[PDB]
């Protein structure tokens, strides 16, 4: 059965609700982004209308085989009517293709569903500026003040400088970057660009990147691992065993690996500046965990919500415990008393 925080009252619509079978009364299923917790249940046998971005549409067609007749892509920043209701898709600053959805209900209520997002001041000059929002369905992944991390630009600066230094000291070092989903592509793309290399990967991961509308992609990536000195590997292989095993396969081309594991937040954030991050090292293998987040920090979330001033907030993450729900409700009430809405 479909929970309440995935239904849009007064419409036939759901959001990110494909794991419950046929939802009673649902005439249109919205997909915010192509992350497995959110698409859970879609396949080539799905026969209802799916509304989403162009990029999410390319991934449902080519990776999940959903038939073309049921894929409904919408452009961003554009007023659209779906089954009698005005909707707008906005960039969520999450992974490629990810959106927030503005719904203009027939009774005059306006609802924003953030999907997954990384709040930014630039969102204060989208189509959100123009009018009031009564209900906010909010990505609360990091809704507690301990959750701090740097900007994506500082993190990428660190990774570029680390890789360029190492390969300039040792032209025989290989760089490896872990992945398990779409998102965070800037980590491996910026490193390969400083090194003057394409990024090497499996046929399956190449397929996924080819769906993403990245300009000049054919100039940036390849399936020919032998010619490339930046390789992608599944995240589960980013450990001393998996990496040893990978260097053997390269046939004595390389004598050192430097690897990156993008994570979300970890507790080493609470004591260490990005500058001061150090790897784990065994022999000729070094592994850096870097806090590249595609979700809002506490401070970014708080700024967005204090600016939007919604009448009601419905969290969509961390909803499973009484303590989580109570904690989030306390912070929504401080934010509201501090800003005066
Ligand atoms: Ni996500």
From Swiss-Prot:
Q: What is the effect of changing residue 139 to N?
A: Impaired nuclear focus formation, reduced interaction with PIAS and increased sensitivity to cisplatin
Q: What induces it?
A: During mitosis. The mRNA encoding this protein contains an internal ribosome entry site (IRES) in its 5'-UTR. This 5'-UTR generally suppresses translation while specifically promoting expression during mitosis, when cap-dependent translation may be impaired.
Q: Name one GO biological process term.
A: double-strand break repair via nonhomologous end joining
Function noted in UniProt? May be required for DNA interstrand cross-link repair. Also required for checkpoint mediated cell cycle arrest in early prophase in response to mitotic spindle poisons. Possesses beta-lactamase activity, catalyzing the hydrolysis of penicillin G and nitrocefin. Exhibits no activity towards other beta-lactam antibiotic classes including cephalosporins (cefotaxime) and carbapenems (imipenem).
Disulfides per UniProt: none
Q: Which residues form a coiled coil?
A: none
Q: Which residues of the full protein are shown?
A: 700 to 1040 of 1040
Q: Does the keyword Phosphoprotein apply?
A: yes
Assembly and oligomerization: Binds constitutively to TP53BP1. Binds CDC27, which is itself a component of the anaphase promoting complex (APC). Binds PIAS1.
Give expression by tissue. Answer: Expressed in brain, heart, kidney, liver, pancreas, placenta and skeletal muscle.
Q: What is this protein called?
A: DNA cross-link repair 1A protein
- Could you cite one Gene Ontology molecular function of this protein? damaged DNA binding
Recite the UniProt keywords alphabetically. Answer: Cell cycle, Cell division, DNA damage, DNA repair, Hydrolase, Isopeptide bond, Metal-binding, Mitosis, Nucleus, Phosphoprotein, Ubl conjugation, Zinc, Zinc-finger
Q: A cellular component term (GO) from this record?
A: nucleoplasm
Recorded name of the encoding gene: DCLRE1A
